[PDB]
Scaffold this active site. Structure first.
Site, mmCIF file in Angstrom:
data_model
loop_
_atom_site.group_PDB
_atom_site.id
_atom_site.type_symbol
_atom_site.label_atom_id
_atom_site.label_comp_id
_atom_site.label_asym_id
_atom_site.label_seq_id
_atom_site.Cartn_x
_atom_site.Cartn_y
_atom_site.Cartn_z
ATOM 1 C CD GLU A 1 -2.377 1.278 2.794
ATOM 2 O OE1 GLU A 1 -2.009 0.701 4.002
ATOM 3 O OE2 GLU A 1 -3.293 1.732 2.822
ATOM 4 C CG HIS A 2 3.645 2.950 3.168
ATOM 5 N ND1 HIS A 2 4.400 3.882 3.647
ATOM 6 C CD2 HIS A 2 2.642 2.467 4.099
ATOM 7 C CE1 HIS A 2 3.918 4.438 4.688
ATOM 8 N NE2 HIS A 2 2.799 3.381 5.144
ATOM 9 C CD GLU B 1 3.045 4.992 8.543
ATOM 10 O OE1 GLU B 1 2.361 3.914 8.628
ATOM 11 O OE2 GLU B 1 2.893 5.712 7.187
#
Ligand SMILES: CCCCCCCCCCCCCCCCCC(=O)OC[C@H](COP(=O)([O-])OCC(O)COP(=O)([O-])OC[C@@H](COC(=O)CCCCCCCCCCCCCCCCC)OC(=O)CCCCCCCCCCCCCCCCC)OC(=O)CCCCCCCCCCCCCCCCC
Ligand SMILES: CCCCCCCCCCCCCCCCCC(=O)OC[C@H](COP(=O)([O-])OCC(O)COP(=O)([O-])OC[C@@H](COC(=O)CCCCCCCCCCCCCCCCC)OC(=O)CCCCCCCCCCCCCCCCC)OC(=O)CCCCCCCCCCCCCCCCC
Ligand SMILES: CCCCCCCCCCCCCCCCCC(=O)OC[C@H](COP(=O)(O)OCCN)OC(=O)CCCCCCCCCCCCCCCCC
Ligand SMILES: CCCCCCCCCCCCCCCCCC(=O)OC[C@H](COP(=O)(O)OCCN)OC(=O)CCCCCCCCCCCCCCCCC
Lengths: 440, 74
Positions: A59-60, A136
């Site tokens: 997704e990143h 993150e």
């Protein structure tokens, strides 16, 4: 205009199915803005111990670069036409959706078709994204609510892929070779496990044409998850320096199937939610909320109905100081058994009204409508109309709520997850003993 | 002195399980007997000798009293 007429006046969401298996769905009402999104059935529930976190990494890297559009050029096409690109990957679902204008729909699909099918997965992008993921993960460590929920998932689905966090362990993130990402995309981004949802001003015929023209090359026409187990336990992270004590206690609830969701969602609505910055406070109908506001016993509390396919977590998560955890446990458990033993009709009516407002308020705006379409197509196999929801709410009464609460709450081993100054959290034996009422 | 402010502790992670999901007697004899022998070996050398000397002195006192009651050939 008597609600029921308005409920039947909601435009329906037509559903089509390409040969590849992509389920295309649209709902045109009036708006010149649209939200078009691809929903994948991939997530942390499917990754094994080594692939944990691969979905997050994919997704990143999805938006950073593609094949047809090299790198930042993709962002240009999104920004030049004013579209807002977003993606979210929960434990069992993934979604990439863009909000754009109705005119830009033919382009809107194309960019999406570029993101999902043919990404770039550039090695240097992986190298920088690895550090991004590590930082993150630190930020999420600072996120005490998210940490508590992850602890609850770990201690409830122990020994199952469901316990795995979405981001994955930090050790995994380091290795995460490009081959693993390519394999995960290959065996988790297949056409049958895709829903192309589009809300707002999109014509279903136009959506079908664009989807056929831009998604036909995908794989046309096997690990498909396994029933996880509930392991009633608790994880206590005694960190006294933390200001507040986040606690979350949940029990095995229903799934996306098992219409018992409708009564239980009523019962949770009876308990409600409340934090320090609220309105009436002591005057709130919820006994738990009223007591907490009167005695300043909390800084927050919420009722969650996290439901996966085979199972789900149904419970409450509260944030309070170190000197009010035991009283909170008593009051929350007592409310649970009060619902189980004697629900009353008036409380059930209040819960029904609250739940009726929930769905209609949530299904407002292009993005929530598109998200609901995708999630309903993936989970329920269909987009449940609001009229059917209204009928299901209507069929719920006091006896049904009492029966379902007794089935799911009364005398059940719970899963607890505390974090912070949680030394006053009652021992698991006390918590379990609170889950049966001697008087009853 | 009650739950809530007993002491301060940080970075401690503890797990357990429901009493209704795990056996009440997990191999009560597989490791129970070896544990009993281990504790017995640990405490035997420091427990027994004080009792064994009592055993010897009790027997000696009883036998000597019996002998004293017997006549002493006079
Ligand atoms: C008849 C059987 C009992 C029954 O139907 O209801 C018991 C009933 C309350 O049951 P409940 O509705 O499950 O109580 C939940 C409450 O939150 C009250 O409990 P709690 O949530 O505050 O704390 C959990 C736990 C905390 O423990 C206690 O409150 C007492 C535990 C005593 C254990 C024995 C050692 C000490 C003596 O509660 C209990 O153990 C049960 C309630 C207290 C019982 C007191 C009499 C014990 C006699 C032995 O007990 C009483 O009302 C006390 C007087 C009548 C029973 C004794 C005669
Ligand atoms: C005059 C005095 C009158 C009152 C006497 C009793 C007062 C206290 C009763 C409650 C109590 O302390 O319970 C815990 C106390 C010790 O802990 P436990 O309940 O065995 O739990 C496991 C141990 O912590 C550790 O267990 P483990 O790792 O050594 O393995 C299991 C087992 C050894 O495994 C065996 O299979 C036992 C040997 C055969 O250990 C035992 O201590 C077995 C004791 C009963 C046979 O229970 C007993 O000693 C059993 C009841 C008393 C038996 C006679 C003891 C002399
Ligand atoms: C004393 C005789 C019983 C000894 C063993 C049980 C005990 O001490 O307490 C357990 C018993 C049952 O209820 P309990 O599990 O405490 O849960 C209450 C509602 N939360 O709670 C009791 O108070 C025991 C007597 C119940 C009547
Ligand atoms: C010394 C050893 C014996 C101590 C006294 C035992 C009394 C009866 C205990 C009991 O109910 O079960 C004992 C034993 C194991 O019981 P438990 O560890 O709870 O596991 C149950 C599922 N197999 O299960 C059995 O004995 C069989 C029960 C059926």
């Amino acid at each position: 205009a008597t609600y029921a007429q308005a409920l039947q006046s909601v435009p329906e969401t037509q559903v089509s199915q390409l040969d590849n298996g992509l389920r295309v769905a649209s709902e045109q009402s009036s708006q010149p803005t649209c939200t078009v999104g691809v929903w994948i059935d991939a997530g942390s529930r499917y990754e094994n111990e080594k692939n944990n976190g691969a979905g997050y990494f994919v997704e990143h890297l999805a938006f950073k670069g593609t094949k047809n559009r090299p790198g930042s050029a993709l962002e240009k096409e999104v920004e030049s036409m004013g579209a807002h690109l977003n993606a979210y990957s929960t434990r069992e679902h993934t979604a990439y959706y863009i909000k754009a204008l109705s005119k830009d729909l033919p382009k809107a699909v194309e960019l999406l078709a570029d993101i999902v099918q043919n990404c770039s997965l550039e090695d240097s992008q992986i190298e920088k994204e690895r550090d991004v993921i590590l930082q993150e993960l630190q930020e999420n460590d600072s996120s005490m609510r998210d940490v508590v929920f992850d602890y609850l998932h770990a201690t409830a689905f122990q020994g199952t892929p469901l316990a795995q966090s979405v981001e994955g362990p930090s050790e995994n993130v380091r290795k995460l070779s490009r081959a693993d990402l390519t394999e995960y995309v290959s065996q988790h981004y297949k056409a049958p496990r895709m829903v192309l949802a589009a809300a707002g001003g999109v014509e279903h015929r136009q959506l079908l044409d664009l989807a056929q023209k831009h998604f036909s090359s995908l794989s046309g026409t096997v690990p498909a998850f396994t029933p996880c187990r509930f392991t009633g336990s608790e994880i206590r992270h005694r960190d006294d320096a933390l200001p507040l004590a986040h606690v979350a206690i949940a029990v095995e609830g229903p799934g996306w199937a098992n219409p018992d969701n409708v009564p239980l969602q009523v019962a949770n609505a009876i308990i409600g939610h409340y934090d320090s910055t609220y309105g009436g406070g002591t005057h709130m109908s919820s006994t738990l909320a009223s007591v907490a506001a009167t005695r300043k016993l909390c800084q927050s509390f919420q009722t969650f109905n996290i439901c996966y396919a085979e199972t789900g977590l149904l419970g409450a998560h509260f944030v309070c100081d170190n000197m009010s955890i035991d009283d909170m446990m008593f009051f929350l458990q007592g409310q649970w058994m009060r619902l189980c033993t004697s629900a009353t009709e008036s409380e059930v009516v209040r819960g029904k009204n609250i739940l009726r407002n929930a769905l209609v308020s949530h299904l407002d705006g292009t993005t929530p409508v598109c998200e609901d379409i995708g999630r309903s197509l993936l989970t329920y196999g269909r987009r449940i109309p609001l009229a059917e929801w209204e009928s299901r709410i209507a069929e719920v009464d006091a006896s049904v709520v009492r029966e379902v609460c007794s089935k799911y709450f009364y005398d059940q081993c719970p899963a607890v997850a505390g974090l912070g100054p949680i030394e006053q959290l009652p021992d698991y034996n006390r918590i379990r003993s609170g889950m049966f009422w001697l008087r009853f | 002195r009650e739950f809530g402010h007993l002491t301060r502790m940080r970075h401690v992670i503890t797990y357990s399980l429901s009493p209704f999901e795990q056996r009440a007697f997990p191999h009560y004899f597989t490791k129970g007997i070896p544990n009993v022998l281990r504790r017995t070996r640990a405490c035997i050398l420091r427990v027994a000798p004080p009792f064994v000397v009592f055993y010897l002195v009790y027997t000696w006192g009883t036998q000597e009293f019996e002998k004293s009651k017997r006549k002493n050939p006079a």
